[PDB]
PDB file of C-alpha atoms (C1' of nucleotides) and ligand atoms in Angstrom:
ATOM      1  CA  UNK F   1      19.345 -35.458 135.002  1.00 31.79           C
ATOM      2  CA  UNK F   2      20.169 -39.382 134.556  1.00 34.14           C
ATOM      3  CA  UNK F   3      21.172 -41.962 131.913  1.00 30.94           C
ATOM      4  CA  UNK F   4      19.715 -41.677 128.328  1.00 30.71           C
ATOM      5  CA  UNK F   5      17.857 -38.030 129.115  1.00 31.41           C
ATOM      6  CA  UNK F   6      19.881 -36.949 126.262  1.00 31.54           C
ATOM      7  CA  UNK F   7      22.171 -38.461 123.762  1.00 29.10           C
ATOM      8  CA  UNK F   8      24.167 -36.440 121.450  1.00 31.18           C
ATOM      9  CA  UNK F   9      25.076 -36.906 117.974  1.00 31.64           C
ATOM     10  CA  UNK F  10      27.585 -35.972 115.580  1.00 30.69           C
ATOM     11  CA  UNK F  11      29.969 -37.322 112.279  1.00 33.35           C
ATOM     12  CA  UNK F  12      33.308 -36.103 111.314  1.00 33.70           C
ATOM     13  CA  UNK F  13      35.798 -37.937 108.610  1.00 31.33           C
ATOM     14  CA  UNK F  14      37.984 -40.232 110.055  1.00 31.51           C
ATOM     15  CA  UNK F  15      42.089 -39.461 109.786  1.00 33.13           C
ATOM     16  CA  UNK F  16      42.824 -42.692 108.197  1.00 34.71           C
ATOM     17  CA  UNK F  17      43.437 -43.431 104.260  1.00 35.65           C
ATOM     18  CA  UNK F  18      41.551 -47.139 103.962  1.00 35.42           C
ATOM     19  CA  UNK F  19      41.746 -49.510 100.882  1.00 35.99           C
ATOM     20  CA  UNK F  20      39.956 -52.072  99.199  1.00 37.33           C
ATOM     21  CA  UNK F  21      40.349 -55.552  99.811  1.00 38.25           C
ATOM     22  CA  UNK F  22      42.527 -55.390  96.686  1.00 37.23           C
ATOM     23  CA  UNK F  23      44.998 -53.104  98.575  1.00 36.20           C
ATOM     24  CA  UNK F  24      44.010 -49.928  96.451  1.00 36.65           C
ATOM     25  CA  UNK F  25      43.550 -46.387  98.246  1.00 40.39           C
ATOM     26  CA  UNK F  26      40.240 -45.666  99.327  1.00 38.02           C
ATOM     27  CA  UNK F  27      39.429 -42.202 100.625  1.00 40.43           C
ATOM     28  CA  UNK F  28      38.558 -41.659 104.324  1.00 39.99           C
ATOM     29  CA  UNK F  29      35.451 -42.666 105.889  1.00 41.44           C
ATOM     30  CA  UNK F  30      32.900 -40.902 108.529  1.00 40.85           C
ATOM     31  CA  UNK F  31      32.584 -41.994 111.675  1.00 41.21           C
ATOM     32  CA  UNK F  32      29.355 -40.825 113.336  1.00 38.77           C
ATOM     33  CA  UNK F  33      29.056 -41.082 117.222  1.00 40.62           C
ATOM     34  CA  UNK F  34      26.082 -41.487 119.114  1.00 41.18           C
ATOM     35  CA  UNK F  35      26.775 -40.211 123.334  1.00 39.06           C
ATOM     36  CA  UNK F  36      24.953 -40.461 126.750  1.00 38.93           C
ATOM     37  CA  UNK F  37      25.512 -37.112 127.694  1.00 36.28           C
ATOM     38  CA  UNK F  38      25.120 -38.386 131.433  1.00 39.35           C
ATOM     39  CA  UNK F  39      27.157 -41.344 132.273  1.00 38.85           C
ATOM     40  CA  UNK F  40      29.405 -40.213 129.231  1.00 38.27           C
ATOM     41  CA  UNK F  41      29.290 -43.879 127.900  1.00 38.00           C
ATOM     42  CA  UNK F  42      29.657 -43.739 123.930  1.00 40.13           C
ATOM     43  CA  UNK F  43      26.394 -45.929 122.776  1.00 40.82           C
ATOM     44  CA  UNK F  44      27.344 -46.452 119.898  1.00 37.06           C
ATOM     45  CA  UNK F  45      28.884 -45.696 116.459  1.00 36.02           C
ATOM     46  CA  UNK F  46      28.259 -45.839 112.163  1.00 35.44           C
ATOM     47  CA  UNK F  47      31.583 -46.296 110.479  1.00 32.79           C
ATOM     48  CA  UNK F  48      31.471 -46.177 106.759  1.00 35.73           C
ATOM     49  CA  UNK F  49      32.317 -44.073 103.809  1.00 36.92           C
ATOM     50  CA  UNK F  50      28.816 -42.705 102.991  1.00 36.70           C
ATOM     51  CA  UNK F  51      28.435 -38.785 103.493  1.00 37.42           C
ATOM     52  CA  UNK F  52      26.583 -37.421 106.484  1.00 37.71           C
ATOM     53  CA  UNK F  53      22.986 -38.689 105.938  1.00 37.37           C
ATOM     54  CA  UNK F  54      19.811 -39.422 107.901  1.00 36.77           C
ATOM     55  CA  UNK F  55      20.132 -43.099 106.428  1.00 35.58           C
ATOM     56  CA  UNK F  56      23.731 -42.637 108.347  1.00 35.40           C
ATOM     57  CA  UNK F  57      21.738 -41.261 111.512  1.00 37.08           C
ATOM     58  CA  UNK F  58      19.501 -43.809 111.635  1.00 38.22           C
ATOM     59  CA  UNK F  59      22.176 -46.410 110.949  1.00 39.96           C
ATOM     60  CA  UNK F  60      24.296 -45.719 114.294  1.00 42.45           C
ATOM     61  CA  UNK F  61      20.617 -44.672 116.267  1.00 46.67           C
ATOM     62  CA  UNK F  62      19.780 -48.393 115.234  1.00 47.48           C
ATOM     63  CA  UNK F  63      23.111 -49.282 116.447  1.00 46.20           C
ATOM     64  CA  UNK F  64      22.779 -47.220 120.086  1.00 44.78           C
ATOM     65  CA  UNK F  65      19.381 -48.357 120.894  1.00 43.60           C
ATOM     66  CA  UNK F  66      19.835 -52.262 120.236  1.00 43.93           C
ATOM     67  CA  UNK F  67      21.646 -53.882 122.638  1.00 45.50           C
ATOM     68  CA  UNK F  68      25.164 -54.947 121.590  1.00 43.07           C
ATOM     69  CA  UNK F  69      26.480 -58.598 120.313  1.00 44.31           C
ATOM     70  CA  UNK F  70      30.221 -59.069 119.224  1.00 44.23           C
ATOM     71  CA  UNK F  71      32.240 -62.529 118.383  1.00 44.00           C
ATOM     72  CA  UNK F  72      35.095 -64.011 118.933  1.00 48.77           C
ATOM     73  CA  UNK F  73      36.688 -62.464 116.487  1.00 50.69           C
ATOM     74  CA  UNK F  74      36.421 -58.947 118.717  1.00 49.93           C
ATOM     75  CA  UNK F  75      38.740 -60.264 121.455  1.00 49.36           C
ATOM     76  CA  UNK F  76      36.318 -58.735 123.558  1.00 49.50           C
ATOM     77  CA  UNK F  77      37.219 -58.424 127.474  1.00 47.49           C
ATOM     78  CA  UNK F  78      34.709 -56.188 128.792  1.00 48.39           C
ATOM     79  CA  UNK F  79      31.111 -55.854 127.054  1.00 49.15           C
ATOM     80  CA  UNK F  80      29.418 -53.007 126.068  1.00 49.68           C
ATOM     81  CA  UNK F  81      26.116 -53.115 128.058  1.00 47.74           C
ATOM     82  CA  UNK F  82      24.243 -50.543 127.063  1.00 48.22           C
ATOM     83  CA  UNK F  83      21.208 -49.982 125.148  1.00 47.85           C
ATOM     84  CA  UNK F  84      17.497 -48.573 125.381  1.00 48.69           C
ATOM     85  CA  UNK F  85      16.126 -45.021 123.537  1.00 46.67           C
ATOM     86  CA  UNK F  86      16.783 -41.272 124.204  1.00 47.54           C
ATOM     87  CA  UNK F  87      14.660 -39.260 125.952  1.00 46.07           C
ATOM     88  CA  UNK F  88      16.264 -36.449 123.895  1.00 48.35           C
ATOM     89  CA  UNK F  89      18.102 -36.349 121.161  1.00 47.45           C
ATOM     90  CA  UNK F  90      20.600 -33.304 120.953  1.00 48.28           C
ATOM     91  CA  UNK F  91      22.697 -32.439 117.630  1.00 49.90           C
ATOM     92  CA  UNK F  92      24.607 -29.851 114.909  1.00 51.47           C
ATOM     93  CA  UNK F  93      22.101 -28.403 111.817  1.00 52.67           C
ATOM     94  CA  UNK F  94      23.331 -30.473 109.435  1.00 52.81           C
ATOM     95  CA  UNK F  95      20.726 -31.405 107.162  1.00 55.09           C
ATOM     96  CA  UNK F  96      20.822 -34.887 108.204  1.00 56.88           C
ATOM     97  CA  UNK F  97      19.691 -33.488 111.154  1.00 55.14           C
TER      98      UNK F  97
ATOM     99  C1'  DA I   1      64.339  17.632 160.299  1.00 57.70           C
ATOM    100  C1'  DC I   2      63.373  17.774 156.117  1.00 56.72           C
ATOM    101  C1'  DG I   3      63.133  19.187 151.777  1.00 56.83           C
ATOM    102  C1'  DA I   4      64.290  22.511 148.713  1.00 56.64           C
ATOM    103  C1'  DC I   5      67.763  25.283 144.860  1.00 52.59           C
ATOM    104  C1'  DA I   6      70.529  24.305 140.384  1.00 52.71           C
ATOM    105  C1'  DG I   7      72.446  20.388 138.409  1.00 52.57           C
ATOM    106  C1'  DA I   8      74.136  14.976 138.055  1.00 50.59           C
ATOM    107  C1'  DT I   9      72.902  10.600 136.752  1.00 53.01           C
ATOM    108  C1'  DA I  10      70.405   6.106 135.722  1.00 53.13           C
ATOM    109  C1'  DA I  11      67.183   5.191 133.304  1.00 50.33           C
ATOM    110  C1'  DT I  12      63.769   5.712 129.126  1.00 50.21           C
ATOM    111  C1'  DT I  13      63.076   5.871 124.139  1.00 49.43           C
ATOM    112  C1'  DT I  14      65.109   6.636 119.066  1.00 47.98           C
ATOM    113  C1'  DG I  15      67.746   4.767 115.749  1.00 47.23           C
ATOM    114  C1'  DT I  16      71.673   1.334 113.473  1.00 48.38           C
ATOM    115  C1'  DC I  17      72.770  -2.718 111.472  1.00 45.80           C
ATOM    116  C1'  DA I  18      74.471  -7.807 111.661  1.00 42.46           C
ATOM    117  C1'  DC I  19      71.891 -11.729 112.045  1.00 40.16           C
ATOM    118  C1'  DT I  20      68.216 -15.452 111.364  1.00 42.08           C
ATOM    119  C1'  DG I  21      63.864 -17.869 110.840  1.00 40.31           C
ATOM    120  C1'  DT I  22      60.748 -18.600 107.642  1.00 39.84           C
ATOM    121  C1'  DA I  23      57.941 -19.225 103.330  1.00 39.76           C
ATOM    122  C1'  DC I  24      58.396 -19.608  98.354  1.00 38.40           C
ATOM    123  C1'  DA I  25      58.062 -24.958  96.744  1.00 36.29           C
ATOM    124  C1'  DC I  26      50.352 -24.306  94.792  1.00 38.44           C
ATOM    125  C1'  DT I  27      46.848 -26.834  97.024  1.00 36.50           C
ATOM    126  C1'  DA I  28      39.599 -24.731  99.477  1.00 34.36           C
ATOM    127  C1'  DC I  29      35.404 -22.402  98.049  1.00 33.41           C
ATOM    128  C1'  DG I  30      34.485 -27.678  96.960  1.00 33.04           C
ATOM    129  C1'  DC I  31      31.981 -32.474  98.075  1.00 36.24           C
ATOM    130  C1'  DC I  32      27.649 -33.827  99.661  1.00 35.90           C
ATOM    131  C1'  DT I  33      23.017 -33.673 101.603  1.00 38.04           C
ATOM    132  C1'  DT I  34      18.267 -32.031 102.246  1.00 39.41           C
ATOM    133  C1'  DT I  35      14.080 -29.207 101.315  1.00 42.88           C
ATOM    134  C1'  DT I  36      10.897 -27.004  98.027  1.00 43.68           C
ATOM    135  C1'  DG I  37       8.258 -24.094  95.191  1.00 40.81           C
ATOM    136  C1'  DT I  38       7.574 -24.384  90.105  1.00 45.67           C
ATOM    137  C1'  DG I  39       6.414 -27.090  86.275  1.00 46.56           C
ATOM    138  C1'  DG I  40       4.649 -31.346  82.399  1.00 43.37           C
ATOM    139  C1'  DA I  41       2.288 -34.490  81.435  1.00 43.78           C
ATOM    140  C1'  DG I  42      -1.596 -37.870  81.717  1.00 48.00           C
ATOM    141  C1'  DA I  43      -5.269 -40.959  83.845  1.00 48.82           C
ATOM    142  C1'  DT I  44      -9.437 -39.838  85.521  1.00 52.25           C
ATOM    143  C1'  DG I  45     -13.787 -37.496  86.673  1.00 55.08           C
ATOM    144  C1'  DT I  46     -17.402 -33.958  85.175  1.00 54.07           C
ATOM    145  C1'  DC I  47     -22.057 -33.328  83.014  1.00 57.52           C
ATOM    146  C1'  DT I  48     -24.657 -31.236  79.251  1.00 60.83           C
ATOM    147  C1'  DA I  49     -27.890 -29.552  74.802  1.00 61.22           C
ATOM    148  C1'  DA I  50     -29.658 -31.943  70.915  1.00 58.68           C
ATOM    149  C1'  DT I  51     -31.108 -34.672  67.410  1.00 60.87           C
ATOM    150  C1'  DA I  52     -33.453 -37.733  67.472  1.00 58.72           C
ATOM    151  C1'  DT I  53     -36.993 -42.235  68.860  1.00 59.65           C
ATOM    152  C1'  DC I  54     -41.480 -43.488  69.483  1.00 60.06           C
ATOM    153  C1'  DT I  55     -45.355 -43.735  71.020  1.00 58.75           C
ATOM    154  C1'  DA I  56     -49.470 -41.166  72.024  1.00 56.34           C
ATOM    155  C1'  DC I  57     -52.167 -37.119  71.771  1.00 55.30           C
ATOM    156  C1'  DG I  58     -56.311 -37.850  69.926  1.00 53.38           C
ATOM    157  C1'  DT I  59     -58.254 -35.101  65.418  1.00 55.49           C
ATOM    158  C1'  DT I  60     -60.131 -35.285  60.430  1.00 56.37           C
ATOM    159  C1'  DT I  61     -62.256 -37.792  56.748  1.00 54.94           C
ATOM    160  C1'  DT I  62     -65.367 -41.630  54.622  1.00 55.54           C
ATOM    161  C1'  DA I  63     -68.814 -44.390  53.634  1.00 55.97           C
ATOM    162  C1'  DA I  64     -72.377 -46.709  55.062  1.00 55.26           C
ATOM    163  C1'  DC I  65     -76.749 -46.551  56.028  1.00 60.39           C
ATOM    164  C1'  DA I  66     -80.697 -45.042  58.866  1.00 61.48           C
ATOM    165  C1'  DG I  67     -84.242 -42.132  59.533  1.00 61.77           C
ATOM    166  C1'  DT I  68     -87.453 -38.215  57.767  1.00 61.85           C
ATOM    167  C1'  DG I  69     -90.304 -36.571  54.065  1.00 58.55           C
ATOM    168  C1'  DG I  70     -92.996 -36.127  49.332  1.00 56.02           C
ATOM    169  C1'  DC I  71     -95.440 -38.550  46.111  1.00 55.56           C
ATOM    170  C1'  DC I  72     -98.649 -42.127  44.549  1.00 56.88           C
ATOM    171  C1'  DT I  73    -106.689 -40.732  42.345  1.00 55.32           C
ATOM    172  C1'  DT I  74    -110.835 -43.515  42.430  1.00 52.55           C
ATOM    173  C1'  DA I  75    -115.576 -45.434  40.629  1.00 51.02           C
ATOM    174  C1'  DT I  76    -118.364 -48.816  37.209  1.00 48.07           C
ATOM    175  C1'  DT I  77    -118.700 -52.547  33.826  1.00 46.65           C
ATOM    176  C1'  DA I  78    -117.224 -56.074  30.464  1.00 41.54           C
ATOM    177  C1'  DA I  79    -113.645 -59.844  29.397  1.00 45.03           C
ATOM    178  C1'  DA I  80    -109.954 -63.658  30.257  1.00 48.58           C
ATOM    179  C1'  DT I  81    -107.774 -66.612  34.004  1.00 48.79           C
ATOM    180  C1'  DG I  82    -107.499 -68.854  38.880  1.00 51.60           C
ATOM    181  C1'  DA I  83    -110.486 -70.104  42.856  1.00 49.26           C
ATOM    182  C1'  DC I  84    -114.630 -70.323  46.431  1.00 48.87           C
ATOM    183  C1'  DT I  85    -119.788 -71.276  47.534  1.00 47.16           C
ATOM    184  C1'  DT I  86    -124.627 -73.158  46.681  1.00 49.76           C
ATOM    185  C1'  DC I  87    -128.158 -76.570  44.348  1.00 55.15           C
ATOM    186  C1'  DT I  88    -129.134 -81.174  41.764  1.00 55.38           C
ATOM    187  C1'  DC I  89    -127.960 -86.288  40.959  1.00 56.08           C
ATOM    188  C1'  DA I  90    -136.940 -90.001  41.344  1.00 59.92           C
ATOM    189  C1'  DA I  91    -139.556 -94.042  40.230  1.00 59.30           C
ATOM    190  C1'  DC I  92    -143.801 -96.299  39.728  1.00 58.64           C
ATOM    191  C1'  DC I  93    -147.842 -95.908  37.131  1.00 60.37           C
ATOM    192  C1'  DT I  94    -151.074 -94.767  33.112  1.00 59.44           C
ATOM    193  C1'  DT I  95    -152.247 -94.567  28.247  1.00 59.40           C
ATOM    194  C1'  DC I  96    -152.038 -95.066  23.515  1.00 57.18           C
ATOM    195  C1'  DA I  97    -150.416 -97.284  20.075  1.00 55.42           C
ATOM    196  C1'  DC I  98    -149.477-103.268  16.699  1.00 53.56           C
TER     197       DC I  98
HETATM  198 MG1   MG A   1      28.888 -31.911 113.211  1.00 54.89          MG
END
DNA sequence: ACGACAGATAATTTGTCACTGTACACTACGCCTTTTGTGGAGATGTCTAATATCTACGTTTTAACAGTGGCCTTATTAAATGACTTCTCAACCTTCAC
């Protein structure tokens, strides 16, 4: 019925080969999306190369419910002002989930 | 008129065969996560019979001695000894003898 009644979550492996620093190949990572499912905003995201895990959950969860801070090194025009809990929480059976 | 006989005729499917688009180019049941009932110690808590100890229960044994009980004959006369008691503890005068 309105903002944050439920946000949806789900991971899937990212169609990009990454690298070290170095340079050397470095297989894909997850990304794992957190969603108002009013509003349709994306809250926010984990991006890393650890499997589907509730440490992974609670990573972008941590990273949806705080508000957001980026420098200047995200040339940031707009700002992504959004933040505050579910009231629901809506998601695959993974068993991360 | 329309439609109604037997047969024409535009479909309809059955069957040929030259052509071409494509896979074969090895390269998924495998990586990763979570729950979960079974299992191995290993610190810790549980709580007894029992072989004493550890005095007392008091109970025997001793000897000391205290009390009861039996026995013990009694007289006279003499002696020795030691004592006791009582009594006594004059004094002047006369007479005849040298
Ligand atoms: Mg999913």
């Amino acid at each position: 019925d309105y903002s944050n009644h439920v946000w949806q979550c789900d991971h899937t492996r990212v169609d990009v080969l990454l690298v070290d620093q170095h340079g050397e190949i470095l297989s894909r990572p997850w990304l794992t999306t957190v969603i108002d499912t009013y509003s349709r905003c994306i809250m926010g995201i984990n991006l890393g190369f650890d499997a589907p895990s509730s440490g992974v959950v609670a990573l972008a969860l941590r990273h949806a419910i705080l508000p957001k801070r980026y420098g200047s090194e995200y040339k940031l025009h707009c700002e992504w002002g959004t933040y505050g809990k579910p009231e629901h929480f809506y998601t695959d059976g993974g068993k991360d989930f």
